[PDB]
Design a protein around this ligand. Structure first.
Ligand SMILES: [Zn+2]
Length: 73
């Protein structure tokens, strides 16, 4: 985030904030949750993101022939 701000926890609330702004892939979301901020490894981060997305069940939107998740429209 600006000036090195960025999420320090990987949560449903944080994912919801991003997916309500624009559709995003899993790769796109992972970029928002950086080890330098959270202290979680890439494996730990992808695993809890998977849990969050399974629960949230956001709408799938196909963009560039790739599934994106969206909480907008
Ligand atoms: Zn995309």
């Amino acid at each position: 985030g600006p000036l090195g701000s960025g999420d320090v926890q990987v949560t449903e609330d944080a994912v919801r904030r991003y997916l309500t702004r624009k559709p995003m892939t899993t790769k796109d979301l992972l970029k928002k949750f950086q080890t330098k901020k959270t202290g979680l490894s890439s494996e730990q981060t992808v695993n809890v993101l998977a849990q969050i997305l399974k629960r949230l069940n956001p709408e799938r939107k196909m963009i560039n022939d790739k599934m994106h998740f969206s909480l907008k429209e």
